[PDB]
Amino acid sequence: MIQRTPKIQVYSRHPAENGKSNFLNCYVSGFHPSDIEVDLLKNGERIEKVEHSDLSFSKDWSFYLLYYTEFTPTEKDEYACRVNHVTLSQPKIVKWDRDM
Amino acid sequence: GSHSMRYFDTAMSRPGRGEPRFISVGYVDDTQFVRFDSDAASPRRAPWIEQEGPEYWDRNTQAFKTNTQTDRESLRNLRGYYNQSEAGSHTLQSMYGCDVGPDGRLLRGHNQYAYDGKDYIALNEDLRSWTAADTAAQITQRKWEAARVAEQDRAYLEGTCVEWLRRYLENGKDTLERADPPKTHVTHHPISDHEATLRCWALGFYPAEITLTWQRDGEDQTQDTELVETRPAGDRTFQKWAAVVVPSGEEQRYTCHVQHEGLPKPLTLRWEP
Amino acid sequence: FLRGRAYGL
Ligand code: NA
């Protein structure tokens, strides 16, 4: 059957400023079928507790999910989102960049 | 202005791991107000739905139970229609609901299905006939015609769907009928001595529909613009950006234009160093 | 308000 690989965006709920509490988001979308594995990483290590939205989809039938966790950004800590899907040979890592 | 109610339903088989999972998510516009999930540990989303009583919930839960059984049976029949083995996982999706205009009258109804990500069958805009994608869906079409299913769907869409959407809009007025305008800014990042990226930002807006474009000397830069998909912030609102790479020193030839329902008229933004 | 879909594919 036909498969669609996820698009991935990593970003914060509010403009990031070091020392102020925020939410870190990883939005995965445009994918099919629906099974997908998403991790938020802090300095390369999986954040053990993360929430996600309820499975839904766009008019083109492709699925989307928002994964998110509360965090307080600092200047040194690096964050990323790691995604695996049947369409992907290996997990894809997207780094959090405050300007994207 | 106009509003919509839509349910997005997903059934997914999982051989060896129990019955197919079924989940139904309801929205008014871009606000999710309910979720039913066959895998929910405890059945008992929006604040304006809280005023609905036990009878409302009884009826909705029964509808969900019916849909769970109907979609699980459909998944079984679909494997047959496509000569597929019993070993793989498959997906059935449906969307249905109504759109109303400013006066709350029906603008149009929706009821359509996809199997494994491909359109299968849909109720036409007339609410009286079907469009089937292939010879399998032609079978469904024959059965649904024989059973007068469209007559029943038209009945729900013109009556119940619209009636409930009006009621939700009335009870949820403060949020459902409030548009939040985008907060906008332009950033500038050199990519080399000779070029820089201008990125036009829109944050905190509702509903999700928005138009962001870059112009150079008043000409749209559609082909040269990077546009990210509109994305949820997590707090009801949405975000989007559009970026263009410009020659160093030419930044003032570029304007970002923002259109959104929450805006009296379009914004025109420039990089301000 | 959920539609109960009684007819399958
Ligand atoms: Na047809």
Coordinates of C-alpha atoms and ligand atoms in Angstrom, one line a residue:
Chain A
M1 CA 0.0 0.0 0.0
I2 CA 1.0 3.7 -0.1
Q3 CA 3.1 5.2 2.7
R4 CA 3.9 8.7 3.6
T5 CA 6.9 9.8 5.6
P6 CA 6.5 12.3 8.5
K7 CA 7.4 15.9 8.4
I8 CA 8.9 17.0 11.7
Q9 CA 9.1 20.4 13.4
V10 CA 10.7 21.1 16.8
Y11 CA 9.8 24.4 18.6
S12 CA 8.7 26.1 21.7
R13 CA 5.1 27.1 22.7
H14 CA 6.3 30.7 23.6
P15 CA 9.4 32.5 22.4
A16 CA 12.4 30.9 24.2
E17 CA 14.2 32.8 26.9
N18 CA 16.8 31.2 29.2
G19 CA 15.6 30.6 32.7
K20 CA 11.9 31.0 31.9
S21 CA 9.6 28.0 31.9
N22 CA 8.1 27.0 28.5
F23 CA 6.9 24.0 26.5
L24 CA 9.0 22.0 24.0
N25 CA 7.0 20.7 21.1
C26 CA 7.6 18.2 18.4
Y27 CA 5.0 18.2 15.7
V28 CA 4.9 15.2 13.3
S29 CA 2.5 15.3 10.4
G30 CA 1.8 14.2 6.8
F31 CA 2.5 10.6 7.6
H32 CA 0.7 7.3 6.9
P33 CA 0.2 4.7 8.3
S34 CA -0.3 6.0 11.8
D35 CA 2.2 4.0 13.9
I36 CA 5.0 6.3 14.8
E37 CA 7.7 6.6 17.5
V38 CA 8.6 10.1 18.8
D39 CA 11.1 11.0 21.5
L40 CA 12.1 14.4 22.9
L41 CA 15.8 14.5 23.7
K42 CA 17.7 16.6 26.3
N43 CA 21.4 16.6 25.7
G44 CA 21.0 13.4 23.6
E45 CA 19.0 11.6 26.3
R46 CA 15.4 10.6 26.0
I47 CA 13.0 12.7 28.2
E48 CA 11.3 9.9 30.1
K49 CA 7.9 11.7 30.5
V50 CA 6.2 13.4 27.6
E51 CA 2.6 14.0 26.6
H52 CA 1.0 13.8 23.2
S53 CA -2.2 14.9 21.4
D54 CA -5.0 12.5 20.3
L55 CA -4.4 10.9 16.9
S56 CA -6.1 12.9 14.2
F57 CA -5.6 13.6 10.5
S58 CA -5.7 16.3 7.8
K59 CA -8.2 16.5 4.8
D60 CA -5.6 14.6 2.7
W61 CA -5.9 11.7 5.2
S62 CA -2.4 12.1 6.5
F63 CA -1.9 11.8 10.3
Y64 CA -0.5 14.3 12.7
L65 CA 0.5 14.3 16.4
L66 CA 1.9 16.9 18.8
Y67 CA 4.4 15.6 21.4
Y68 CA 5.2 18.1 24.2
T69 CA 6.9 18.5 27.6
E70 CA 7.3 21.4 30.1
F71 CA 10.9 22.7 30.1
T72 CA 13.0 25.6 31.2
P73 CA 15.5 26.4 28.4
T74 CA 19.1 27.4 29.2
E75 CA 22.1 28.4 27.1
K76 CA 24.0 25.1 27.2
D77 CA 21.2 22.5 27.1
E78 CA 20.5 21.1 23.7
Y79 CA 17.1 19.7 22.7
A80 CA 16.0 17.6 19.8
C81 CA 13.2 15.3 18.6
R82 CA 13.8 11.8 17.4
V83 CA 11.3 10.1 15.1
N84 CA 11.0 6.6 13.7
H85 CA 8.4 5.4 11.2
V86 CA 8.0 2.5 8.8
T87 CA 9.1 4.8 6.0
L88 CA 12.4 5.6 7.7
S89 CA 15.4 3.3 7.6
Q90 CA 16.7 4.7 10.8
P91 CA 15.4 7.3 13.4
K92 CA 15.5 10.9 12.2
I93 CA 16.8 13.5 14.6
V94 CA 15.8 17.1 14.3
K95 CA 17.6 19.6 16.6
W96 CA 15.7 22.4 18.3
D97 CA 16.7 25.7 16.8
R98 CA 15.2 28.8 18.5
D99 CA 15.1 30.6 15.1
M100 CA 12.9 27.9 13.5
Chain B
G1 CA -18.2 34.0 10.0
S2 CA -18.5 30.4 8.9
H3 CA -18.0 27.4 11.2
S4 CA -17.6 23.7 10.9
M5 CA -18.1 20.6 13.0
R6 CA -16.1 17.5 12.0
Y7 CA -15.4 14.1 13.4
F8 CA -12.1 12.4 12.3
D9 CA -12.3 8.7 12.9
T10 CA -9.5 6.1 12.6
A11 CA -9.8 2.3 12.8
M12 CA -6.6 0.3 12.6
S13 CA -6.3 -3.4 12.6
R14 CA -3.4 -5.0 14.6
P15 CA -3.4 -8.8 14.1
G16 CA -2.2 -10.7 17.2
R17 CA -2.7 -7.6 19.4
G18 CA -6.5 -7.7 19.9
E19 CA -9.4 -6.0 18.0
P20 CA -8.8 -3.0 15.8
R21 CA -8.2 0.2 17.7
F22 CA -10.9 2.8 17.0
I23 CA -10.6 6.5 17.8
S24 CA -13.0 9.3 17.0
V25 CA -12.0 13.0 17.6
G26 CA -14.5 15.8 17.3
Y27 CA -13.8 19.4 16.4
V28 CA -15.5 22.7 16.1
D29 CA -13.3 24.6 13.6
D30 CA -9.7 24.1 15.0
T31 CA -10.8 23.3 18.5
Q32 CA -11.0 19.6 19.6
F33 CA -13.9 19.2 22.0
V34 CA -14.2 15.4 22.4
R35 CA -12.3 12.1 22.0
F36 CA -13.5 8.6 22.2
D37 CA -10.9 5.8 22.1
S38 CA -11.6 2.1 22.2
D39 CA -8.3 1.7 24.2
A40 CA -9.3 4.4 26.8
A41 CA -8.7 3.0 30.3
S42 CA -11.4 5.3 31.7
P43 CA -14.1 6.8 29.4
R44 CA -14.9 9.7 31.8
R45 CA -11.9 18.1 25.1
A46 CA -13.7 21.4 25.9
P47 CA -15.2 23.3 28.8
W48 CA -18.4 24.3 26.9
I49 CA -19.2 20.6 26.5
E50 CA -19.2 20.2 30.3
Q51 CA -22.7 21.6 30.6
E52 CA -24.1 18.7 28.6
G53 CA -25.9 16.2 30.8
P54 CA -25.8 12.4 31.3
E55 CA -28.4 11.8 28.5
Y56 CA -26.1 13.6 26.0
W57 CA -23.2 11.4 27.1
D58 CA -25.3 8.2 27.0
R59 CA -26.2 8.9 23.4
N60 CA -22.7 9.8 22.3
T61 CA -21.1 6.8 24.0
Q62 CA -23.7 4.5 22.3
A63 CA -22.9 6.1 18.9
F64 CA -19.2 5.5 19.6
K65 CA -19.9 1.8 20.4
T66 CA -21.9 1.5 17.2
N67 CA -19.1 3.1 15.2
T68 CA -16.5 0.8 16.7
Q69 CA -18.5 -2.3 15.7
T70 CA -19.3 -0.9 12.3
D71 CA -15.8 0.0 11.5
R72 CA -14.3 -3.3 12.8
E73 CA -16.8 -5.1 10.5
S74 CA -15.9 -2.8 7.6
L75 CA -12.2 -3.6 8.1
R76 CA -13.1 -7.3 7.8
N77 CA -15.2 -6.8 4.7
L78 CA -12.5 -4.6 3.1
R79 CA -9.8 -7.3 3.4
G80 CA -12.1 -9.4 1.3
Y81 CA -12.9 -6.7 -1.3
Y82 CA -9.2 -6.3 -2.0
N83 CA -8.2 -10.0 -1.8
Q84 CA -5.8 -9.2 1.1
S85 CA -4.4 -11.8 3.6
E86 CA -5.3 -11.7 7.3
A87 CA -1.8 -11.0 8.4
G88 CA -1.2 -7.2 7.8
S89 CA -2.4 -4.1 9.5
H90 CA -4.9 -1.9 7.7
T91 CA -6.4 1.5 8.3
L92 CA -10.0 2.8 7.8
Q93 CA -10.6 6.6 8.2
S94 CA -13.7 8.7 7.9
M95 CA -14.6 12.3 8.2
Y96 CA -18.0 13.6 8.6
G97 CA -19.8 16.7 9.7
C98 CA -21.3 20.0 8.6
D99 CA -20.3 23.6 7.7
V100 CA -22.6 26.5 8.4
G101 CA -22.6 30.1 7.4
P102 CA -22.7 33.3 9.6
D103 CA -26.4 32.9 9.9
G104 CA -26.0 29.3 11.0
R105 CA -27.6 27.7 8.0
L106 CA -26.2 24.6 6.3
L107 CA -23.5 25.5 3.8
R108 CA -22.6 21.8 3.1
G109 CA -22.4 18.4 4.5
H110 CA -19.6 15.8 4.6
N111 CA -19.3 12.1 4.8
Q112 CA -16.3 10.3 3.3
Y113 CA -14.0 7.4 3.8
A114 CA -10.4 6.3 3.0
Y115 CA -8.9 2.8 3.2
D116 CA -5.1 2.5 3.6
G117 CA -4.8 6.2 2.9
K118 CA -6.6 6.1 -0.4
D119 CA -10.1 7.7 -1.0
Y120 CA -12.7 4.9 -1.0
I121 CA -16.2 6.5 -1.1
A122 CA -17.7 9.9 -0.4
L123 CA -21.2 11.4 -0.1
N124 CA -21.6 14.0 -2.9
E125 CA -22.4 17.6 -2.1
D126 CA -26.0 17.0 -3.1
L127 CA -26.3 14.6 -0.1
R128 CA -28.1 12.1 -2.3
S129 CA -25.5 10.3 -4.4
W130 CA -22.1 8.7 -3.9
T131 CA -18.7 8.8 -5.6
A132 CA -16.8 5.5 -5.4
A133 CA -13.1 5.3 -6.1
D134 CA -12.8 1.7 -7.5
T135 CA -14.7 -1.6 -8.0
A136 CA -14.6 -2.4 -4.3
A137 CA -16.2 0.9 -3.4
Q138 CA -18.8 0.3 -6.1
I139 CA -20.0 -2.6 -4.0
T140 CA -20.5 -0.4 -1.0
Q141 CA -22.2 2.1 -3.2
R142 CA -24.7 -0.5 -4.5
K143 CA -25.5 -1.7 -0.9
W144 CA -25.8 1.9 0.4
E145 CA -28.2 2.8 -2.5
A146 CA -30.3 -0.3 -1.9
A147 CA -30.5 0.6 1.8
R148 CA -31.1 4.3 1.2
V149 CA -28.2 5.3 3.4
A150 CA -27.7 8.7 1.8
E151 CA -31.3 9.7 2.8
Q152 CA -30.4 9.0 6.4
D153 CA -27.1 10.8 6.2
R154 CA -28.8 13.8 4.6
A155 CA -31.2 13.8 7.5
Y156 CA -28.4 13.9 10.1
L157 CA -26.4 16.5 8.3
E158 CA -29.3 18.9 7.6
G159 CA -30.9 18.5 11.0
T160 CA -28.9 17.1 14.0
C161 CA -25.4 18.2 12.9
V162 CA -26.4 21.8 12.2
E163 CA -28.6 21.9 15.4
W164 CA -25.7 20.8 17.6
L165 CA -23.1 23.0 15.9
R166 CA -25.3 26.0 16.5
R167 CA -25.7 25.0 20.2
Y168 CA -21.9 24.5 20.7
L169 CA -21.3 27.9 19.0
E170 CA -23.7 29.5 21.4
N171 CA -22.3 27.9 24.5
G172 CA -18.7 28.3 23.5
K173 CA -19.0 31.8 22.0
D174 CA -16.2 33.4 24.0
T175 CA -13.6 31.2 22.4
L176 CA -15.2 29.6 19.4
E177 CA -16.2 33.0 17.9
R178 CA -13.1 34.9 19.0
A179 CA -10.2 35.2 16.5
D180 CA -6.8 35.8 17.9
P181 CA -4.6 37.8 15.6
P182 CA -1.0 36.8 14.8
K183 CA 1.8 38.4 16.7
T184 CA 4.4 39.1 14.0
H185 CA 8.1 39.9 13.6
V186 CA 10.9 39.6 11.1
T187 CA 14.3 38.1 11.8
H188 CA 17.5 38.4 9.8
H189 CA 20.3 35.8 9.7
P190 CA 23.3 36.1 7.4
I191 CA 24.0 32.8 5.6
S192 CA 27.3 34.1 4.1
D193 CA 29.0 37.4 3.3
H194 CA 26.7 37.8 0.3
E195 CA 23.3 36.5 1.4
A196 CA 20.9 36.5 4.4
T197 CA 17.7 34.9 5.4
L198 CA 14.7 37.0 6.2
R199 CA 12.1 35.0 8.2
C200 CA 8.6 36.3 8.7
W201 CA 7.0 35.0 11.9
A202 CA 3.3 34.7 12.9
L203 CA 2.6 33.4 16.5
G204 CA -0.4 33.0 18.8
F205 CA -3.1 33.1 16.2
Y206 CA -6.6 31.3 16.0
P207 CA -8.0 29.9 13.9
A208 CA -5.3 28.1 11.9
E209 CA -6.0 29.6 8.5
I210 CA -3.5 32.2 7.6
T211 CA -1.6 33.6 4.6
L212 CA 2.1 34.6 4.8
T213 CA 3.9 35.7 1.7
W214 CA 7.1 37.5 0.8
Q215 CA 7.2 40.1 -2.0
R216 CA 10.3 41.5 -3.7
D217 CA 9.6 44.9 -5.3
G218 CA 5.9 44.1 -5.0
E219 CA 6.2 40.7 -6.8
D220 CA 5.3 37.5 -4.9
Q221 CA 8.2 35.2 -4.3
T222 CA 6.2 32.0 -4.2
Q223 CA 8.9 29.9 -5.8
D224 CA 11.7 31.2 -3.6
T225 CA 9.9 31.2 -0.3
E226 CA 10.3 28.4 2.3
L227 CA 6.9 28.0 4.0
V228 CA 6.6 25.7 7.0
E229 CA 3.3 23.9 7.7
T230 CA 1.1 25.7 10.2
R231 CA 1.7 24.1 13.6
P232 CA 0.0 24.0 17.0
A233 CA 1.5 25.9 19.9
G234 CA -0.3 23.6 22.5
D235 CA -2.5 26.4 24.0
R236 CA -5.2 26.6 21.3
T237 CA -3.1 28.9 19.1
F238 CA -1.0 28.2 15.9
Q239 CA 2.3 29.3 14.5
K240 CA 3.8 29.7 11.0
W241 CA 6.8 31.2 9.3
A242 CA 7.9 32.1 5.8
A243 CA 11.6 32.7 4.8
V244 CA 13.4 34.0 1.8
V245 CA 17.2 34.3 1.1
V246 CA 18.1 37.8 -0.1
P247 CA 21.2 39.5 -1.3
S248 CA 23.1 41.3 1.4
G249 CA 22.0 45.0 1.4
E250 CA 18.8 44.4 -0.5
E251 CA 16.7 43.7 2.5
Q252 CA 14.4 46.7 2.1
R253 CA 13.2 45.5 -1.3
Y254 CA 11.4 42.7 0.6
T255 CA 8.0 42.9 2.4
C256 CA 6.2 40.2 4.3
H257 CA 2.4 40.3 4.0
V258 CA 0.1 38.7 6.6
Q259 CA -3.6 38.0 6.2
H260 CA -5.6 36.6 9.1
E261 CA -9.3 36.7 10.2
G262 CA -8.2 38.3 13.5
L263 CA -6.7 41.2 11.5
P264 CA -8.8 44.3 10.4
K265 CA -6.6 44.4 7.3
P266 CA -3.4 42.8 6.1
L267 CA -0.1 43.6 7.9
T268 CA 3.0 44.7 5.9
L269 CA 6.2 43.9 7.6
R270 CA 9.8 44.7 6.8
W271 CA 13.1 43.8 8.6
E272 CA 13.9 46.6 10.9
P273 CA 17.6 46.5 11.9
Chain C
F1 CA -22.6 15.3 18.6
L2 CA -21.6 11.9 17.2
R3 CA -23.4 10.3 14.3
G4 CA -24.0 6.6 14.9
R5 CA -23.0 5.0 11.6
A6 CA -25.1 1.8 11.3
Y7 CA -24.1 0.8 7.8
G8 CA -20.6 -0.4 7.0
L9 CA -18.5 -0.7 3.9
Ligands
NA1 NA -19.2 6.4 -8.3

